[PDB]
Design a binder for this molecule. Structure first.
Ligand SMILES: *C/C=C(C)/C=C/C=C(C)/C=C/C1=C(C)CCCC1(C)C
Ligand SMILES: CCCCCCCCCCCCCCCCCCCC
Length: 223
C-alpha cells in the first residue's frame, strides 16, 4: 500500500516533467514534411491530461483505500489506449511517407480500419475489466484479453509496418510493453498496482519524450 503510493508519486513527478516538455514541443518549428509529429504530440498531451486526472484521483483515494480500486484504471485506459494506437499508426505512416502526410488524410482514407483496431482494443479492455472486477475467472480473462491484444497488434502490423525496420523495432517494443499489462493482471493488488504505476511512465510519458526528441531533431535539421 505504501509502495503503491510511492510509485504513484514517482509517476506523477515524471508526468509533470513530460507535460511541460510536451507543451514546449507544440511551439517548436517544423518543415511541412514533419507537422504530423506535432499532431501526434497534441494527442499524447490529451492522453497525459486523462492519465494525470486518474493519478490525482488515485493519490487522494489511497489516503483511505478500503477496497481493490485497480478496476478504476480502465476508465483511463478506455479513453487513452485507442488514442495511443492512432498515434502509432500516424508515426508508422510518417516513417513510410516521402511527402508530409497529415493525420486528416490517414483518417479520411483508413477510418474503417482504425475503427476495427480500436474495437479489438475495446474488447481486450472489456474482458480485462470483467476479470479485474471478478465477474469472470483470471484464466478466461488472460485468454480473451491476450486474443484481442494479438488481434489489435496484428491489424496494426499488416497494414502500417510496410517492411520498415524502424516501424518493426517500435512495434516490438510497444507490443512487449502492452503485454506486461497482461502479466501485471496476474499479481496481487499491491504488486499489480505498483507495476501499472511504472508501466504508465513507459507507455505514455517516455513515448511523449521520444516524439519530443524526434520533433527537436527534425526542427534542428530544418534550421
Ligand atoms: C496507458 C495504458 C495502457 C497502454 C494500457 C494497456 C493495457 C493493456 C495492454 C491490458 C492488457 C490486458 C491483457 C493483455 C489481458 C489481461 C487483461 C488486460 C486488459 C490487463
Ligand atoms: C470508486 C470511485 C470511482 C469513481 C471514478 C473515478 C474516476 C477516475 C479518473 C479517471 C480518468 C478519466 C478521465 C477524465 C477526463 C474526462
Amino acid at each position: 500500500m505504501d509502495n503503491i503510493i510511492m510509485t504513484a508519486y514517482i509517476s506523477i513527478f515524471v508526468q509533470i516533467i513530460t507535460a511541460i516538455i510536451s507543451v514546449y514541443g507544440l511551439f517548436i518549428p517544423l518543415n511541412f514534411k514533419d507537422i504530423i509529429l506535432r499532431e501526434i504530440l497534441i494527442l499524447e498531451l490529451i492522453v497525459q491530461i486523462i492519465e494525470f486526472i486518474f493519478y490525482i484521483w488515485l493519490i487522494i483515494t489511497l489516503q483511505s483505500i478500503n477496497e481493490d480500486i485497480t478496476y478504476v484504471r480502465y476508465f483511463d485506459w478506455v479513453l487513452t489506449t485507442p488514442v495511443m494506437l492512432l498515434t502509432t499508426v500516424y508515426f508508422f505512416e510518417y516513417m513510410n511517407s516521402d511527402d508530409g502526410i497529415r493525420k486528416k488524410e490517414i483518417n479520411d482514407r483508413d477510418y474503417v480500419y482504425l475503427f476495427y483496431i480500436c474495437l479489438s482494443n475495446f474488447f481486450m479492455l472489456l474482458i480485462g475489466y470483467l476479470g479485474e472486477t471478478k465477474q469472470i475467472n483470471k484464466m478466461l480473462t488472460l485468454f480473451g484479453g491476450s486474443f484481442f491484444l494479438f488481434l489489435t497488434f496484428y491489424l496494426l502490423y499488416v497494414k502500417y509496418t510496410k517492411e520498415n525496420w524502424m516501424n518493426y523495432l517500435v512495434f516490438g517494443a510497444m507490443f512487449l510493453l502492452w503485454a506486461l499489462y497482461g502479466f501485471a493482471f496476474m499479481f496481487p493488488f499491491s504488486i499489480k498496482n505498483q507495476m501499472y504505476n511504472i508501466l504508465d511512465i513507459f507507455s505514455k510519458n517516455f513515448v511523449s519524450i521520444f516524439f519530443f526528441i524526434v520533433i527537436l531533431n527534425q526542427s534542428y535539421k530544418l534550421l
